[PDB]
Tab-separated table of C-alpha atoms in Angstrom:
chain	number	residue	atom	x	y	z
A	13	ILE	CA	-39.866	-21.125	20.975
A	14	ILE	CA	-37.528	-18.852	18.685
A	15	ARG	CA	-39.234	-14.971	19.524
A	16	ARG	CA	-35.520	-14.864	21.758
A	17	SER	CA	-33.874	-15.496	17.966
A	18	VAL	CA	-35.187	-12.443	16.269
A	19	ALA	CA	-34.346	-10.447	19.171
A	20	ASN	CA	-30.635	-10.588	18.912
A	21	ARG	CA	-30.585	-10.768	14.668
A	22	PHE	CA	-26.787	-9.341	14.872
A	23	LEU	CA	-25.569	-12.321	16.439
A	24	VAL	CA	-27.195	-14.416	13.658
A	25	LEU	CA	-26.001	-11.852	11.568
A	26	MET	CA	-21.998	-12.736	12.530
A	27	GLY	CA	-22.727	-16.079	13.055
A	28	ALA	CA	-23.499	-16.635	8.956
A	29	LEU	CA	-21.307	-14.532	8.322
A	30	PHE	CA	-18.717	-16.531	10.454
A	31	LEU	CA	-19.797	-19.709	9.203
A	32	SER	CA	-19.743	-18.365	5.501
A	33	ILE	CA	-16.460	-17.733	5.485
A	34	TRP	CA	-14.930	-21.348	7.028
A	35	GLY	CA	-17.369	-23.374	4.230
A	36	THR	CA	-15.550	-20.822	1.688
A	37	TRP	CA	-12.352	-21.541	3.264
A	38	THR	CA	-13.089	-25.515	3.811
A	39	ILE	CA	-14.451	-25.574	0.041
A	40	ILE	CA	-11.482	-23.768	-1.377
A	41	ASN	CA	-8.914	-26.000	0.761
A	42	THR	CA	-11.125	-29.697	0.576
A	43	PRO	CA	-9.739	-33.479	-1.662
A	44	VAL	CA	-12.113	-33.373	-5.030
A	45	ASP	CA	-11.518	-36.599	-6.603
A	46	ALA	CA	-13.744	-38.732	-8.970
A	47	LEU	CA	-15.219	-42.277	-8.489
A	48	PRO	CA	-13.224	-42.785	-5.529
A	49	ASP	CA	-11.866	-46.499	-3.798
A	50	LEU	CA	-13.935	-48.977	-4.182
A	51	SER	CA	-12.591	-52.597	-5.481
B	856	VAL	CA	24.085	-19.363	-15.259
B	857	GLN	CA	23.967	-22.294	-16.996
B	858	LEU	CA	22.221	-26.157	-16.155
B	859	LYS	CA	23.543	-28.996	-17.410
B	860	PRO	CA	21.991	-32.158	-18.038
B	861	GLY	CA	21.619	-34.204	-14.902
B	862	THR	CA	21.421	-31.413	-11.679
B	863	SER	CA	18.226	-29.484	-10.569
B	864	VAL	CA	18.498	-25.999	-7.962
B	865	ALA	CA	16.432	-26.125	-4.941
B	866	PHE	CA	15.912	-23.243	-2.263
B	867	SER	CA	15.161	-23.803	0.978
B	868	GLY	CA	16.166	-22.055	5.005
B	869	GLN	CA	14.421	-20.663	7.516
B	870	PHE	CA	12.146	-17.776	5.380
B	871	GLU	CA	9.918	-20.214	3.831
B	872	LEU	CA	8.261	-21.723	7.232
B	873	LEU	CA	7.722	-18.242	8.116
B	874	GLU	CA	5.988	-17.698	4.758
B	875	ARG	CA	3.302	-19.729	6.129
B	876	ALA	CA	3.235	-18.887	9.624
B	877	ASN	CA	2.475	-15.256	9.137
B	878	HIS	CA	0.329	-15.904	6.479
B	879	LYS	CA	-1.372	-18.224	8.385
B	880	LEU	CA	-2.109	-15.494	11.535
B	881	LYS	CA	-2.532	-13.281	8.911
B	882	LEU	CA	-5.868	-15.478	8.129
B	883	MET	CA	-6.736	-15.992	12.054
B	884	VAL	CA	-6.433	-12.487	13.722
B	885	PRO	CA	-9.219	-11.428	12.337
B	886	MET	CA	-11.935	-13.791	13.005
B	887	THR	CA	-10.417	-13.915	16.220
B	888	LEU	CA	-10.476	-10.031	16.529
B	889	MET	CA	-14.170	-10.465	15.409
B	890	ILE	CA	-14.969	-13.013	17.599
B	891	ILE	CA	-14.786	-10.041	20.454
B	892	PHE	CA	-16.674	-7.897	18.659
B	893	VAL	CA	-19.705	-10.278	19.015
B	894	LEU	CA	-19.095	-10.790	22.202
B	895	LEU	CA	-18.014	-7.036	23.407
B	896	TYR	CA	-21.731	-5.598	23.258
B	897	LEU	CA	-23.377	-8.879	24.637
B	898	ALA	CA	-23.665	-6.424	27.910
B	899	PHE	CA	-24.581	-3.114	25.959
B	900	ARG	CA	-25.949	-4.316	22.959
B	901	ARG	CA	-24.825	-2.134	20.851
B	902	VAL	CA	-21.844	-1.724	18.699
B	903	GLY	CA	-20.186	1.914	20.007
B	904	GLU	CA	-19.359	0.332	23.478
B	905	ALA	CA	-17.543	-2.832	21.429
């Protein structure tokens, strides 16, 4: 069910690179805090 | 130029927004170009053609 997925390894690599870059970006730009509003 | 107690200085103008705009596109234009590569060799399945 994933044989068609391994036959295009290059697309998977490009998608993984895009995802890694997007994740690094959102992590660099995500707001961080501690004990958020809970009252 | 000395400063008097109770005085502040700041800068502004069009230039400011530019410092962002270029940066922003300088961050995205590459990725867009990559979106071309991945989508280009789908008809050829080889990098040389793209």
